[PDB]
Write a protein that binds this DNA or RNA. Structure first.
Lengths: 197, 127, 48, 61, 171, 58, 106
RNA sequence: GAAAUUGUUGAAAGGGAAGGGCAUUUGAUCAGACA
RNA sequence: AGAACUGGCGAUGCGGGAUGAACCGAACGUAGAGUUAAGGUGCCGGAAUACACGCUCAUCAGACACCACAAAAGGUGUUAG
RNA sequence: GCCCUGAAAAUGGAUGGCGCUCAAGCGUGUUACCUAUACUCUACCGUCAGGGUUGAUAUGAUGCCCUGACGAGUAGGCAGGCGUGGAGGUCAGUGACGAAGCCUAGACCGUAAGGUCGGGUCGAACGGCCUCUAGUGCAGAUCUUGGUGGUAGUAGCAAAUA
RNA sequence: CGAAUUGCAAUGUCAUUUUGCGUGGGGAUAAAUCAUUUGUAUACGACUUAGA
């Protein structure tokens, strides 16, 4: 229902998120995935690394600047997964992927905004407890992504600046709750509670 | 020239049935010719390829040869041909031939305006 | 079919795009690491 | 989609009118169709289906 | 399937030499009378000299359960044909009804041995009466005193695709 | 004729208004026997964001 | 006061189709809030409009409308079918149509 | 005084072809006006 | 390489098997509405991230018969007997 | 029963792809749902068959009307038709107030072959109907003749002292 | 106080970028290419140089 949808990709599964996206962004929703470095993917790290190396093996022999462009960052990994779910060789798919913006970390326009969660992609709900999973940051860093130590220095900063906001808002919230609780016994409110409100 | 007993003229396949590879080659005209080949695809009616004429596309017998005005067309070259339509005014429309002189077109038009007949090419050779 | 007699490659595939450089002044794609204790001093120079 | 026992669109092997263009024969047929239709006598139909016949199936007596 | 239990009486066809032949009875598990009557002639035709044509079916009656709101330990003696050889098995189940025990026996047999309905013959189903003849641990662990356990990891279903708070698995 | 010929185009009469005043005064009489209803009729219906018409009543 | 609307917004998903074949006569509509065929049966017969722009002002407006209706449901998730006077142009895949309540049964 | 082929003007389109079938939008054009 | 019976292709498009002369379904006038076949319902892709009992974690898993490959011999790895 | 080892091949690569691990995998089961030129209903065309109608109206039955069923198709057979050059009749046919021809993302008719109209150009003969007749209909034949293109403003115009 | 006669429904328009023109209010006063030249360059382009 929202015009734009900001998605925290922490503790999310890759394909199970990307299918949901690839349908919504084809149906016409502008979607902004954010904090893609903390994404998760099933199976063990060595297994996923073997699969990525099998993907790196595939390059056009006669000129390797023509072939599968192996993007090493998590945003681009997820973009690959979505683009495989989308008909990107058409205007429909190109327009659809123009409605998508993926980021590592949480930049300014989307740090002061509300983030949501796709529950049919969450690791904690889908995976059996005890199974091994994999983190996309460690994976990308293992295959040649050089900016994990930077988004970390920025995310803790964002987090400090967010926790102080929460620390202020929580006090404002208790004050408003203590101001509104002084009217709950009133006939304006025990007449509302007869309607559920 | 009211002529309002006719019912809902429908036309199956209002397109023109062009020949195969009339657009690729200038020698192959657009006039329809069946493809008698053996390794053909129009002859075998594959998917995505063009549509061929059949009698299934044939028009209703009540709305055959009618122009959308509800009339069917009769060619006249002179007044003697018009006077045949003095009864059948609400069914036949008097198209004038392509070879008549402007001197005689006005005679025909004037006679038809009196007989109530409807003409389909009355702005012809007029100036 | 295989080569009758093996021999190494000619050239180096890492000095590739064996083209003209984009500027006559070559650019330093890498500087030393910074020791955040030593005195402030230049790292390089350009001469003729 | 039907499994046909019989051949479809099978003309009856007979001729329901002459091959000739003789006006007077056509008129005789106009008469005997009327009689064969509006009469229960099978003479009329026999004569009719005989008026259609070739010169070799209509031989001389 | 959604099974049912049937009681099928059958009879080799009468003759002047023996116009009161022997009625044979079978208690069969199946989804409908049709395949029940088919299985009756499958088992009887393994033991006695008769067929459908050379025989008839007298009575066919559904057997409903007497105490379907009672938990029972159903011991089950069965035989199944594998890809290489034929074997027997005994399994205990803890369902309330004979038919339900069968329904969950066909299933876990197909799981653990990849044996289909067409391979399995259910020989005997026995309600065990006392809590001392049970010998299978996966049943005995539910025959304890003051049995209690939790469901730790809960997963709430969702009718909407976007949610605005991280879930909790607490029960 | 699309330039206001003024042949019975826009003139509201003074006969309907008595028949309008006779019913509404007898009807507001029944409305004012219950509260918050003059305001109800004065308002206008609109669907908000979370409104599911197949789920809500009238 | 801030809201004035009397319609439900929905999306033109696609045409009716098999795999590798489509029927542009029939279009598929995703309505908001709907999740089942029951509770979509309410929206049957209801009119639909696709409102778009054009540069040639005709009859005193740049906005133009293509009308249609809802005919029947789609399988298990609250999608429906629609049939317009003049079928929709396929660049509207992922565009907002508006379903009215004009033929009502409440 | 045709066509192939070509020049100028005008309209339109164009990320490693073009052309074609079904459906519709948009632009042009024609319609009949039931006058 | 040579035969028997039926069916089909050749002479035959259509839905499915990604693709395919032969497989599955089903055989064709032009159109509308409805229902289905074989096959399928995460997304590409129209259709349940539907329900239920179980097995499996594979450092080249496995995944629509014809079909596009797999044996003997071993594993307290696990499950049941 | 599942999984692993056995099980090694040559451009980079294929459960169709992404991707999936209490599956989006395997075995089995229950409903719901999608959709083929198939099935059902209706309209329309055509063919085949059966029947009614010369009461006699437009004497025509070449037809008109009702009813039911059916429609794949190479080689090949038959039928009904379109078109072309000339011939015999006929419209007391068109026409220098402009015949024929040519151009026309301008119109109409027919399932189609094709016909008809408007406009522009042009300048002297040409059509419709009933029949006759044939040197009668082209995308091809490494077809014949004539003409024309991309290649392409390209290869190249450099032996013999200047 | 008025909102009626848009006559039983027909988007019954406010969004959002770009662009031109005019009104009036201030604000700002240049480089590149060719041609010539150089040879750290060079098949031609290009590169690198110099020139009131």
């Amino acid at each position: 229902s929202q015009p734009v949808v900001v998605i925290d990709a922490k503790d999310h599964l890759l394909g199970r998120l990307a299918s949901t996206i690839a349908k919504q962004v084809l149906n016409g929703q502008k979607i902004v995935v954010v904090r893609a470095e903390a994404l998760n993917i099933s199976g063990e790290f060595f297994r996923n690394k073997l699969k990525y190396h099998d993907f790196l093996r595939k390059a056009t022999a006669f000129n390797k600047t023509r072939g599968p462009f192996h993007f090493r960052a998590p945003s681009r990994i997820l973009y690959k997964a979505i683009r495989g779910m989308v008909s990107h060789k058409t205007a429909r798919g190109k327009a659809a992927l123009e409605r998508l913006k993926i980021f590592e970390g949480i930049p300014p326009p989307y740090d002061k905004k509300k983030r949501v969660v796709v529950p049919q992609a969450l690791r904690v709900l889908r995976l059996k407890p005890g199974r091994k999973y994999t983190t996309l940051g460690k994976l990308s860093t293992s295959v040649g992504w050089k900016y994990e130590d930077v988004v970390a220095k920025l995310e803790d900063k964002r987090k400090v600046r967010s926790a102080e906001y929460y620390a202020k808002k929580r006090a404002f919230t208790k004050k408003v709750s203590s101001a509104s609780a002084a009217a709950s016994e009133s006939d304006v409110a025990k007449q509302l509670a007869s309607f559920g409100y | 020239m009211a002529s309002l007993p006719h019912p809902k003229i429908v036309k199956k396949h209002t397109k023109k049935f062009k020949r195969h590879h009339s657009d690729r080659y200038h020698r192959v005209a657009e006039n329809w010719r069946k493809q008698k080949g053996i390794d053909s695809v129009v002859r075998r009616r594959f998917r995505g390829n063009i549509s061929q004429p059949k009698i299934g596309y044939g028009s209703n017998k009540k709305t055959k040869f009618l122009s959308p005005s509800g009339h069917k067309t009769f060619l006249v070259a002179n007044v003697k041909d018009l006077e045949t339509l003095t009864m059948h005014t609400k069914t036949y429309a008097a198209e004038i031939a392509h070879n008549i002189s402007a001197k005689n077109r006005v005679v025909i038009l004037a006679r038809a305006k009196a007989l109530g007949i409807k003409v389909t090419n009355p702005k012809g050779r007029l100036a | 079919s295989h080569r009758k007699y093996e021999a190494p490659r000619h050239g180096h595939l890492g000095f590739l795009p064996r083209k003209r450089a984009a500027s006559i002044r070559a650019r330093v794609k890498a500087f030393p690491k910074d020791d955040r204790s030593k005195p402030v001093a230049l790292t390089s120079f350009l001469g003729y | 989609g039907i499994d046909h026992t019989s051949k479809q669109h099978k003309r009856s092997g007979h001729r329901t009118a002459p091959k000739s263009d003789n006006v007077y024969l056509k008129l005789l047929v106009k008469l005997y169709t009327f009689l064969a239709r509006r009469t229960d006598a099978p003479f009329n139909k026999v004569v009719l289906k005989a008026l259609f016949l070739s010169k070799i199936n209509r031989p001389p007596v | 399937a959604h099974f049912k239990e049937y009681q099928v009486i059958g009879r080799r066809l009468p003759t002047e030499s023996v116009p009161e032949p022997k009625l044979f009875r079978m208690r069969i598990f199946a989804s409908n009378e049709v395949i029940a009557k088919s299985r009756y002639w499958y088992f009887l035709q393994k033991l006695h000299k008769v067929k459908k044509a050379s025989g008839e079916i007298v009575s066919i009656n559904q057997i409903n359960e007497a105490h379907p709101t009672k938990v029972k330990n159903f011991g089950v003696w069965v035989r199944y044909d594998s890809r290489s050889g034929t074997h027997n098995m005994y399994k205990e189940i803890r369902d309330v009804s004979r038919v339900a025990a069968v329904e969950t026996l066909y299933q876990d047999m197909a799981a653990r041995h990849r044996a289909r309905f067409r391979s399995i013959h259910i020989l005997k189903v026995a309600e065990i009466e006392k809590t001392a003849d049970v010998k299978r641990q996966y049943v005995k662990q539910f025959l304890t005193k003051d049995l209690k356990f939790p469901l730790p990891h809960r997963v709430q279903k969702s009718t909407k695709t976007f949610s605005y708070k991280r879930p909790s698995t607490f029960y | 004729a699309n330039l206001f010929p003024e042949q019975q185009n826009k003139e509201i009469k003074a006969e309907r208004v008595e028949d309008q005043k006779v019913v509404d005064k007898a009807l507001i009489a029944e409305i004012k026997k219950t509260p918050l209803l003059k305001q109800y009729l004065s308002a206008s219906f609109s669907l908000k964001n979370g409104d599911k018409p197949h789920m809500l009543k009238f | 006061a801030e809201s004035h609307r009397l319609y439900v917004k929905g999306k033109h998903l696609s045409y009716q189709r098999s795999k590798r074949v489509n029927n542009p006569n029939v279009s598929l509509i995703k309505i908001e809030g709907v999740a089942t065929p029951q509770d979509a049966q309410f929206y049957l017969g209801k009119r639909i409009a696709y409102v778009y722009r054009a540069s040639k002002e005709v009859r005193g407006s740049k906005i133009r409308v293509m009308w249609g209706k809802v005919t029947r449901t789609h399988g298990n998730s609250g999608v429906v079918r629609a049939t317009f006077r003049n079928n929709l142009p396929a660049k509207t895949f992922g565009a907002s149509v508006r379903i009215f309540l004009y033929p009502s049964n409440i």
